[PDB]
Write a protein that binds this ligand. Structure first.
Ligand code: NAG
Ligand code: NAG
Ligand code: NAG
Lengths: 48, 35, 135, 49
Protein backbone atom coordinates (compact mmCIF):
# COMPACT_ATOMS: atom_id res chain seq x y z
CA UNK A 1 0.00 0.00 0.00
CA UNK A 2 2.94 2.36 0.60
CA UNK A 3 4.06 2.22 -3.03
CA UNK A 4 0.72 3.54 -4.30
CA UNK A 5 0.46 6.18 -1.56
CA UNK A 6 3.81 7.69 -2.56
CA UNK A 7 2.68 8.07 -6.18
CA UNK A 8 -0.91 9.00 -5.30
CA UNK A 9 -0.65 12.80 -5.11
CA UNK A 10 1.87 15.49 -6.06
CA UNK A 11 2.21 16.74 -2.46
CA UNK A 12 3.81 13.54 -1.13
CA UNK A 13 7.38 14.72 -1.81
CA UNK A 14 6.71 18.36 -0.93
CA UNK A 15 9.52 18.64 1.61
CA UNK A 16 12.18 17.73 -0.96
CA UNK A 17 10.48 19.91 -3.59
CA UNK A 18 10.61 23.42 -2.12
CA UNK A 19 14.28 22.74 -1.32
CA UNK A 20 15.06 22.59 -5.04
CA UNK A 21 12.57 25.34 -5.94
CA UNK A 22 13.94 27.84 -3.42
CA UNK A 23 17.45 27.25 -4.78
CA UNK A 24 16.39 27.87 -8.39
CA UNK A 25 13.80 30.59 -7.82
CA UNK A 26 16.47 32.54 -5.92
CA UNK A 27 18.82 32.33 -8.91
CA UNK A 28 16.29 33.83 -11.34
CA UNK A 29 15.79 36.94 -9.21
CA UNK A 30 19.57 37.36 -9.17
CA UNK A 31 19.71 37.30 -12.98
CA UNK A 32 16.65 39.49 -13.52
CA UNK A 33 17.99 42.05 -11.02
CA UNK A 34 20.67 43.36 -13.37
CA UNK A 35 18.10 44.97 -15.69
CA UNK A 36 17.41 47.74 -13.15
CA UNK A 37 18.89 51.23 -13.21
CA UNK A 38 19.19 52.16 -9.51
CA UNK A 39 18.70 55.78 -10.51
CA UNK A 40 21.32 55.78 -13.27
CA UNK A 41 20.67 56.87 -16.85
CA UNK A 42 20.62 53.35 -18.27
CA UNK A 43 20.97 49.75 -17.15
CA UNK A 44 23.51 48.96 -19.88
CA UNK A 45 27.09 49.62 -18.82
CA UNK A 46 28.71 50.22 -22.21
CA UNK A 47 26.34 52.97 -23.36
CA UNK A 48 26.92 55.07 -20.23
CA UNK B 1 17.16 26.77 -21.54
CA UNK B 2 17.32 28.99 -18.46
CA UNK B 3 20.36 27.05 -17.25
CA UNK B 4 22.08 28.25 -20.44
CA UNK B 5 21.05 31.83 -19.61
CA UNK B 6 23.69 31.73 -16.84
CA UNK B 7 26.37 33.47 -18.91
CA UNK B 8 26.72 35.91 -16.00
CA UNK B 9 28.91 33.52 -14.00
CA UNK B 10 26.32 31.54 -12.02
CA UNK B 11 27.48 27.91 -12.15
CA UNK B 12 26.58 24.75 -10.24
CA UNK B 13 29.26 22.36 -9.01
CA UNK B 14 28.60 18.60 -8.92
CA UNK B 15 28.35 16.72 -5.62
CA UNK B 16 31.25 14.57 -4.51
CA UNK B 17 29.15 11.44 -3.93
CA UNK B 18 27.58 10.21 -7.15
CA UNK B 19 24.06 8.81 -7.07
CA UNK B 20 25.14 5.27 -7.97
CA UNK B 21 27.42 5.22 -4.90
CA UNK B 22 24.77 6.49 -2.48
CA UNK B 23 22.57 3.58 -3.57
CA UNK B 24 25.37 1.25 -2.42
CA UNK B 25 25.53 2.69 1.10
CA UNK B 26 21.77 2.22 1.36
CA UNK B 27 22.09 -1.35 0.05
CA UNK B 28 24.53 -2.29 2.82
CA UNK B 29 22.27 -0.79 5.48
CA UNK B 30 19.36 -2.92 4.23
CA UNK B 31 21.46 -6.09 3.87
CA UNK B 32 23.07 -5.97 7.31
CA UNK B 33 19.87 -5.11 9.16
CA UNK B 34 17.96 -8.18 7.95
CA UNK B 35 20.67 -10.82 8.46
CA UNK C 1 30.56 48.02 -32.97
CA UNK C 2 27.06 48.08 -34.59
CA UNK C 3 25.56 51.56 -34.72
CA UNK C 4 27.05 52.39 -31.27
CA UNK C 5 26.46 49.00 -29.65
CA UNK C 6 29.93 48.18 -28.39
CA UNK C 7 30.53 44.69 -27.07
CA UNK C 8 32.64 41.55 -27.22
CA UNK C 9 31.80 38.07 -28.43
CA UNK C 10 31.51 35.74 -31.40
CA UNK C 11 29.02 36.28 -34.23
CA UNK C 12 27.10 33.43 -35.83
CA UNK C 13 24.09 32.74 -38.06
CA UNK C 14 20.58 32.85 -36.59
CA UNK C 15 17.21 31.75 -37.94
CA UNK C 16 14.92 33.94 -35.82
CA UNK C 17 12.87 36.36 -37.91
CA UNK C 18 12.83 40.12 -37.30
CA UNK C 19 9.94 42.32 -38.35
CA UNK C 20 10.93 45.33 -40.49
CA UNK C 21 10.68 47.77 -37.55
CA UNK C 22 12.93 45.71 -35.23
CA UNK C 23 16.72 45.81 -35.11
CA UNK C 24 17.75 44.48 -31.70
CA UNK C 25 16.87 41.33 -29.82
CA UNK C 26 16.79 40.85 -26.05
CA UNK C 27 16.47 38.18 -23.37
CA UNK C 28 15.24 37.89 -19.77
CA UNK C 29 18.30 39.65 -18.36
CA UNK C 30 17.46 42.52 -20.77
CA UNK C 31 20.82 42.46 -22.56
CA UNK C 32 21.13 42.51 -26.33
CA UNK C 33 21.88 39.14 -27.91
CA UNK C 34 20.79 39.47 -31.56
CA UNK C 35 21.48 42.28 -34.03
CA UNK C 36 20.91 42.96 -37.71
CA UNK C 37 23.93 43.87 -39.82
CA UNK C 38 23.30 47.41 -41.13
CA UNK C 39 24.68 46.81 -44.70
CA UNK C 40 22.92 43.54 -45.52
CA UNK C 41 19.63 42.44 -43.95
CA UNK C 42 20.92 39.23 -42.35
CA UNK C 43 20.44 38.43 -38.66
CA UNK C 44 23.38 37.66 -36.37
CA UNK C 45 23.35 35.98 -32.96
CA UNK C 46 25.70 37.22 -30.23
CA UNK C 47 27.19 34.87 -27.64
CA UNK C 48 30.18 35.49 -25.36
CA UNK C 49 33.59 33.87 -25.55
CA UNK C 50 34.49 30.69 -23.69
CA UNK C 51 35.02 31.16 -19.96
CA UNK C 52 35.29 28.98 -16.88
CA UNK C 53 37.27 28.25 -13.74
CA UNK C 54 40.67 26.86 -12.81
CA UNK C 55 41.56 24.78 -9.75
CA UNK C 56 44.97 23.60 -8.55
CA UNK C 57 45.66 20.19 -7.01
CA UNK C 58 48.72 20.31 -4.77
CA UNK C 59 50.26 18.22 -2.01
CA UNK C 60 52.04 20.03 0.80
CA UNK C 61 54.63 22.58 -0.23
CA UNK C 62 57.34 20.79 1.74
CA UNK C 63 56.28 17.38 0.42
CA UNK C 64 56.69 18.40 -3.23
CA UNK C 65 56.43 21.23 -5.74
CA UNK C 66 54.40 19.32 -8.36
CA UNK C 67 50.77 20.19 -9.05
CA UNK C 68 47.73 19.22 -11.11
CA UNK C 69 45.27 21.68 -12.64
CA UNK C 70 41.55 21.13 -13.26
CA UNK C 71 39.43 23.00 -15.82
CA UNK C 72 35.93 23.10 -14.39
CA UNK C 73 33.03 21.92 -16.52
CA UNK C 74 34.59 21.91 -19.98
CA UNK C 75 34.85 19.27 -22.70
CA UNK C 76 38.51 18.39 -22.80
CA UNK C 77 38.98 19.32 -26.50
CA UNK C 78 37.97 22.97 -25.98
CA UNK C 79 41.15 24.14 -24.21
CA UNK C 80 43.87 22.81 -26.60
CA UNK C 81 42.50 25.06 -29.35
CA UNK C 82 42.92 28.19 -27.22
CA UNK C 83 46.67 27.64 -26.72
CA UNK C 84 48.12 30.75 -28.38
CA UNK C 85 49.82 33.96 -27.32
CA UNK C 86 47.52 36.71 -26.01
CA UNK C 87 44.51 34.39 -26.02
CA UNK C 88 44.20 32.98 -22.46
CA UNK C 89 44.07 34.93 -19.20
CA UNK C 90 46.46 32.53 -17.41
CA UNK C 91 49.72 32.76 -19.33
CA UNK C 92 51.01 29.30 -18.29
CA UNK C 93 49.53 27.48 -21.27
CA UNK C 94 52.54 25.16 -21.31
CA UNK C 95 50.74 23.04 -18.73
CA UNK C 96 47.78 22.32 -21.02
CA UNK C 97 50.18 20.33 -23.19
CA UNK C 98 51.44 18.45 -20.15
CA UNK C 99 50.65 14.96 -18.91
CA UNK C 100 47.85 12.69 -20.05
CA UNK C 101 44.36 14.15 -19.75
CA UNK C 102 41.59 12.24 -17.98
CA UNK C 103 38.04 13.49 -18.58
CA UNK C 104 35.63 13.61 -15.62
CA UNK C 105 32.13 14.98 -15.05
CA UNK C 106 33.65 18.14 -13.52
CA UNK C 107 36.02 18.72 -16.45
CA UNK C 108 39.25 17.08 -17.49
CA UNK C 109 42.24 17.41 -15.19
CA UNK C 110 45.73 17.67 -16.66
CA UNK C 111 48.93 16.40 -15.07
CA UNK C 112 47.61 13.40 -13.10
CA UNK C 113 47.32 9.83 -14.35
CA UNK C 114 44.36 7.50 -13.85
CA UNK C 115 44.94 4.18 -12.09
CA UNK C 116 42.01 1.75 -11.83
CA UNK C 117 42.46 0.23 -8.38
CA UNK C 118 40.83 1.79 -5.32
CA UNK C 119 42.14 3.70 -2.31
CA UNK C 120 40.72 6.00 0.35
CA UNK C 121 39.87 9.54 -0.71
CA UNK C 122 42.68 12.04 -0.10
CA UNK C 123 41.90 15.18 -2.13
CA UNK C 124 38.26 15.14 -3.33
CA UNK C 125 37.95 16.03 -7.01
CA UNK C 126 34.24 15.55 -7.68
CA UNK C 127 31.66 13.03 -8.90
CA UNK C 128 33.44 10.04 -7.39
CA UNK C 129 37.09 10.91 -8.10
CA UNK C 130 39.84 11.64 -5.56
CA UNK C 131 43.48 12.53 -6.23
CA UNK C 132 46.51 11.57 -4.16
CA UNK C 133 50.31 11.70 -4.08
CA UNK C 134 51.79 8.22 -4.44
CA UNK C 135 54.86 6.38 -5.72
CA UNK D 1 32.00 35.02 -10.60
CA UNK D 2 32.22 38.41 -8.89
CA UNK D 3 34.16 40.17 -11.64
CA UNK D 4 31.92 39.11 -14.53
CA UNK D 5 28.45 39.36 -12.98
CA UNK D 6 28.94 43.04 -12.17
CA UNK D 7 31.11 44.39 -15.00
CA UNK D 8 30.46 41.90 -17.78
CA UNK D 9 32.59 42.31 -20.94
CA UNK D 10 33.57 45.88 -20.03
CA UNK D 11 37.27 46.70 -19.79
CA UNK D 12 36.86 50.02 -17.95
CA UNK D 13 34.63 48.58 -15.20
CA UNK D 14 36.85 45.75 -13.96
CA UNK D 15 39.63 48.23 -13.14
CA UNK D 16 37.25 50.35 -11.07
CA UNK D 17 36.09 47.24 -9.20
CA UNK D 18 39.64 46.74 -7.89
CA UNK D 19 39.38 49.88 -5.75
CA UNK D 20 36.66 48.21 -3.65
CA UNK D 21 39.23 46.01 -1.93
CA UNK D 22 38.28 42.54 -0.71
CA UNK D 23 34.57 42.19 -1.50
CA UNK D 24 34.86 39.51 -4.18
CA UNK D 25 37.23 37.25 -2.25
CA UNK D 26 34.94 37.30 0.80
CA UNK D 27 32.06 35.99 -1.31
CA UNK D 28 34.26 33.26 -2.78
CA UNK D 29 35.29 32.32 0.77
CA UNK D 30 31.72 32.23 2.09
CA UNK D 31 30.30 30.19 -0.79
CA UNK D 32 33.15 27.68 -0.57
CA UNK D 33 32.18 27.19 3.06
CA UNK D 34 28.67 26.24 1.99
CA UNK D 35 29.91 23.94 -0.78
CA UNK D 36 32.39 22.00 1.37
CA UNK D 37 29.83 21.61 4.15
CA UNK D 38 27.25 20.07 1.80
CA UNK D 39 29.56 17.09 1.30
CA UNK D 40 29.67 16.55 5.07
CA UNK D 41 25.89 16.38 5.40
CA UNK D 42 25.82 13.36 3.09
CA UNK D 43 28.98 11.80 4.55
CA UNK D 44 27.46 11.70 8.05
CA UNK D 45 24.06 10.22 7.18
CA UNK D 46 24.80 7.33 4.83
CA UNK D 47 28.41 6.49 5.77
CA UNK D 48 27.78 5.02 9.23
CA UNK D 49 29.13 1.62 8.12
C1 NAG E 1 56.66 20.67 5.93
O1 NAG E 1 55.41 20.06 5.56
C2 NAG E 1 55.21 18.77 6.15
C3 NAG E 1 53.93 18.22 5.57
O2 NAG E 1 53.72 16.88 5.99
C4 NAG E 1 55.18 18.90 7.67
O3 NAG E 1 55.04 17.61 8.25
C5 NAG E 1 56.46 19.56 8.16
O4 NAG E 1 56.37 19.79 9.57
C6 NAG E 1 56.70 20.88 7.44
N1 NAG E 1 57.97 21.47 7.85
C7 NAG E 1 58.11 22.76 8.18
C8 NAG E 1 56.87 23.60 8.11
O5 NAG E 1 59.19 23.22 8.52
C1 NAG F 1 32.95 16.25 -25.83
O1 NAG F 1 32.49 16.50 -27.18
C2 NAG F 1 32.54 15.33 -28.00
C3 NAG F 1 32.22 15.75 -29.41
O2 NAG F 1 30.85 16.12 -29.54
C4 NAG F 1 31.57 14.30 -27.45
O3 NAG F 1 31.66 13.12 -28.25
C5 NAG F 1 31.88 13.97 -25.99
O4 NAG F 1 30.81 13.21 -25.46
C6 NAG F 1 32.02 15.25 -25.14
N1 NAG F 1 32.52 14.92 -23.82
C7 NAG F 1 31.97 15.36 -22.68
C8 NAG F 1 32.66 14.95 -21.41
O5 NAG F 1 30.98 16.08 -22.67
C1 NAG G 1 43.84 -1.21 -15.28
O1 NAG G 1 44.99 -0.52 -15.77
C2 NAG G 1 46.07 -1.39 -16.11
C3 NAG G 1 47.23 -0.50 -16.51
O2 NAG G 1 47.16 0.75 -15.86
C4 NAG G 1 45.64 -2.35 -17.22
O3 NAG G 1 46.70 -3.27 -17.48
C5 NAG G 1 44.39 -3.11 -16.80
O4 NAG G 1 43.91 -3.89 -17.89
C6 NAG G 1 43.30 -2.14 -16.36
N1 NAG G 1 42.13 -2.86 -15.89
C7 NAG G 1 40.93 -2.78 -16.48
C8 NAG G 1 39.84 -3.59 -15.86
O5 NAG G 1 40.75 -2.09 -17.47
Amino acid sequence: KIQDSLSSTASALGKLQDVVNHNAQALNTLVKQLSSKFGAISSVLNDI
Amino acid sequence: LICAQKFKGLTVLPPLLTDEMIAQYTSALLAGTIT
Amino acid sequence: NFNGLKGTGVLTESNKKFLPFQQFGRDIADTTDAVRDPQTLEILDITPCSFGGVSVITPGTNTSNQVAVLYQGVNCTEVPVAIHADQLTPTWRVYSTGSNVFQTRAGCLIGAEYVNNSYECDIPIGAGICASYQT
Amino acid sequence: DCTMYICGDSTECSNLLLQYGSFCTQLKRALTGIAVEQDKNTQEVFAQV
